[PDB]
Design a binder for this molecule. Structure first.
Ligand code: B12
Ligand code: B12
Ligand code: B12
Ligand code: B12
Ligand SMILES: C[C@H]1O[C@@H](n2cnc3c(N)ncnc32)[C@H](O)[C@@H]1O
Ligand SMILES: C[C@H]1O[C@@H](n2cnc3c(N)ncnc32)[C@H](O)[C@@H]1O
Ligand SMILES: C[C@H]1O[C@@H](n2cnc3c(N)ncnc32)[C@H](O)[C@@H]1O
Ligand SMILES: C[C@H]1O[C@@H](n2cnc3c(N)ncnc32)[C@H](O)[C@@H]1O
Ligand SMILES: [Br-]
Lengths: 197, 194, 193, 198
């Protein structure tokens, strides 16, 4: 399997319910592209394609579920293999109503890969509870991944302003203007998140 | 005890400590044992503590996310045996997924190819996937009762030749209404087709 | 069972089997755990079997090379954070490198930028590199005692602002003689930094 | 190209992340065989020459070599390990340069040969014993220095396995003849030579 065919091979393995094969193809990608690379060049393209294929009516929700659940597990495995250093944590989650979690996981991963103690909470955290936990742990930052725009639209002006000393918002659902309205620092690239920290 | 220590380590955001305590549990009780003696009690306690107002949603999220990751690791350790799969998910509207994962685990430990889909699968899409993979069975975990009451009579009938429904949200009457076989305990799930 | 399975798989040249067993161990014990409970015991057993005359050097080589590769894979998966590095190597004349790799791994897993150099680094060259990179520490793994004895009193004193020595070849007395801080456990190395 | 200089520069600044990104870029551009030919091999040679000229110290070479060995080992595992009678790959007694042997194992694996890399510096009787016990079809040796070959007696490599191949900058046709090994210049033609009779 040539690298440029790994994406289709992996999706095909998943759609035949061949998890073992899917795992082997993912690992080949990991060995070729490296950890950050396999996420960029294999995990993300497959997931986007899964979304487009669902939208065109080529696959159903259950096939997306299968693929997403599998890729989340692969990313979680990489996350546990990265360091978890000591010191004030960075809490990573998604806004209330946002159930797409892989962006948040990616953010947490890229941070840990740079030696930042990113605590991934899971998705969909109410803001008062998030604020309270950041406070109690002395969190240096809160990072939010927004895939959809609607959950940000549902929040009032300034809603993200006091969650932690620094509050970062990114993802396809977020933009500079909405981040300003909400009182968060906008971040375009995962790479520049650790730098900013 | 390990249960309190693990919860305490999670609530301090000490993941390394939490991981070490979980591994100790795993090494002592073994795979099935650590679920029964450590993973399940901590999750229940997290629920009760939230309900009493002792912890907030972010603490529950942290603990649940951690334990889901540990259970997924056990799922991959159990292995994924070959042959026609058994699809495992939760009803539409059901976001609690650890019960489904548990079902998949117990099945895999008995050599059943339990394919965990993730939670919250619309029934037509589930039916379609069972059909395309030639699935022998479908297993649903219901933690809440409400998602089952929202479903039409007979809605679980014929998703596969065998359809099983269990969890704290499910009962015999609702399973009959929906056209599923009710199952009380995970232990008797692999027996039902074995 | 995994230790015996893994050694048996290696001695039959079944690398695929060996890889699967190691991953099983990794999933069960976790990363630090699989090194402690699987990599280390297998390598000790390899050494004892060689010492008894039961296996030749080629079998040990096969097993060692395999386990080094597994550890290197884990090392690359750990973070490499920014900032002043910690250089990790072995004393001149020390060709057993897996202890050093372990030290680098445990450090990286705790967010320390441990640069593993490989084994067997002359002290002047090591000192020079620590200086030029502004390294906060040097860590040395000694498996044999002989490369340390050879060394003069206070040979390790100024390699970097902090210098740590550990491994089965090292002890408190020899560390004091050499001007290094002795460390018994890998766990307490990141703490000390 | 100049990925080579960039990579060496990143290594000498202790920027492993940068070094890894440059290597990956090379791997994505040239492909697996290509990145070895265009990036891994040139950097290693240059490291050697820079040490010899007094421009870098031993610690810098160690850092770079350790890094590139790790990258090559990753490619080895990516080439895969096929079933069937193995080919044992190592270096002669006294030979501690191992990357040539790893390269040989890689090129063999990329052609579907189960090349078992032992690591370097294997005593000949022990190697012969292991080849025999595993039913190895061949042994492959990489010699970087000439001295370890010079130390061996006539015919020493002859019967290590049914076929014995010797290559590397330390080896030549006459020394291979003296030692009873088949000489091989280029790694690409190694699988071909092995599938063919002697
Ligand atoms: C799997 C999936 C789901 C899963 C999520 C599973 C889970 N537990 O995570 C489930 C089943 C829950 C789901 C449900 C739905 N989702 Co959906 N699905 C996806 C899918 C296929 C993959 C999502 C993913 O992980 N992709 C990877 C994402 C994270 O990559 P990315 O956004 O490009 O992220 C990049 C950057 O943004 C950056 N980044 C991300 N976060 C952050 C944060 C920071 C700080 C920084 C610096 C960078 C950064 O990192 C990435 C690098 O490229 C996408 C398809 C797609 N194109 O994304 C949709 C998609 C996002 N979903 C969509 C829809 C419509 C839905 C539903 C409304 C469908 C429905 N009718 O029920 C629901 C809504 C649920 C909700 N959130 O409330 C649409 C969104 C269209 C839109 N924007 O309007 C998509 C695009 C599919 C489509 N083509 O229609 N979904
Ligand atoms: C974590 C958690 C969540 C998480 C889920 C995260 C995830 N999975 O991705 C999140 C944050 C999403 C969540 C949200 C909510 N949940 Co909640 N939470 C939990 C908690 C603490 C653990 C859930 C869990 O892992 N299940 C534990 C399972 C393993 O429970 P169990 O009883 O031990 O299950 C046994 C058997 O049922 C059997 N089994 C399970 N499934 C099956 C299937 C088969 C076939 C068989 C044979 C056996 C079997 O296996 C287990 C053996 O011990 C529980 C507390 C609890 N006691 O369950 C609630 C709990 C279930 N949640 C509850 C509530 C109220 C909610 C919310 C409505 C809160 C809100 N207002 O937003 C939402 C609703 C979401 C939804 N639509 O589903 C309540 C339910 C009360 C009720 N009405 O019955 C609980 C009980 C908390 C409480 N103490 O009040 N929750
Ligand atoms: C593989 C191996 C080799 C390989 C090394 C391959 C490589 N790394 O590239 C090679 C082939 C080179 C080799 C050669 C030789 N070695 Co050898 N071999 C081993 C073996 C089997 C495993 C070594 C290993 O990696 N073990 C795993 C390590 C990680 O375990 P560990 O050292 O106990 O480390 C633990 C602690 O010390 C701690 N730690 C380690 N470093 C540090 C550093 C710090 C700062 C801290 C805090 C902690 C710490 O962490 C680890 C976990 O608890 C051991 C057997 C054994 N029992 O060790 C010998 C062994 C060490 N070798 C030995 C011998 C005899 C030799 C040779 C002299 C044989 C010969 N050629 O004649 C040569 C000498 C080479 C030299 N100059 O160093 C003996 C030494 C006994 C002694 N001291 O008297 C051993 C014990 C074998 C035996 N039973 O006889 N060897
Ligand atoms: C890193 C390195 C080391 C490392 C080895 C690390 C390891 N692998 O574990 C260490 C630090 C151990 C080392 C030490 C020493 N080495 Co040194 N170093 C190197 C270096 C840079 C290795 C580069 C390499 O991996 N070569 C492999 C590739 C890059 O080069 P290559 O051999 O041309 O490979 C091609 C072909 O030969 C072919 N090939 C190789 N093997 C095989 C096998 C077959 C079957 C086939 C078909 C083809 C084939 O493939 C390649 C392209 O097609 C070389 C520099 C160099 N130019 O090679 C020296 C070099 C070989 N070392 C040298 C020296 C001097 C030493 C020491 C004697 C120094 C010392 N006094 O301590 C010791 C001796 C060690 C020993 N063998 O006992 C000199 C040799 C000069 C000479 N005598 O001819 C070199 C050439 C550097 C130099 N010019 O100063 N070294
Ligand atoms: C964005 C992703 O959301 C999933 N999706 C779409 N509709 C639903 C639903 N009602 N319930 C669950 N998941 C759904 C699809 O699989 C799509 O690919
Ligand atoms: C059953 C679990 O659901 C979580 N929970 C309760 N309310 C919400 C909400 N609005 N959003 C997300 N999770 C919530 C709690 O943390 C509880 O422990
Ligand atoms: C400590 C390890 O050193 C290895 N060992 C012992 N003698 C030699 C030799 N001549 N060459 C290479 N390795 C050797 C053995 O395989 C032992 O297991
Ligand atoms: C061929 C390579 O050998 C390394 N080299 C040279 N002398 C020594 C030594 N005493 N110990 C270890 N490595 C050494 C150099 O770094 C050179 O680049
Ligand atoms: Br390696």
């Amino acid at each position: 399997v040539r690298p440029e065919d790994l994406g289709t091979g992996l999706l095909e393995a998943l759609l035949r319910g061949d998890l073992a094969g899917a795992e082997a193809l993912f690992r080949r990608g990991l060995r070729f592209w490296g950890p950050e690379g396999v996420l960029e060049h294999l995990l993300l393209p497959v997931l986007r394609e899964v979304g487009e294929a669902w939208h065109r009516g080529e696959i159903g929700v259950a096939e997306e579920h299968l693929a997403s659940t599998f890729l989340r597990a692969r990313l979680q495995e990489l996350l546990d293999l990265a360091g978890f250093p000591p010191g004030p944590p960075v809490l990573v989650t998604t806004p209330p109503g946002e159930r797409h979690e892989i962006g948040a996981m990616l953010a947490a991963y890229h941070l840990r890969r740079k030696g930042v103690p990113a605590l991934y909470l899971g998705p969909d955290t109410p803001l008062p509870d998030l604020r309270a936990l950041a406070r109690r742990l002395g969190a240096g930052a809160v990072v939010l991944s927004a895939v959809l725009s609607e959950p940000l639209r549902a929040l009032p002006d300034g809603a993200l302003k006091d969650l932690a000393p620094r509050v970062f918002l990114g993802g396809q659902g977020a933009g500079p203007e909405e981040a300003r309205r909400l009182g968060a620092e906008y971040m375009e690239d995962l790479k520049g998140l650790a730098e900013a920290l």
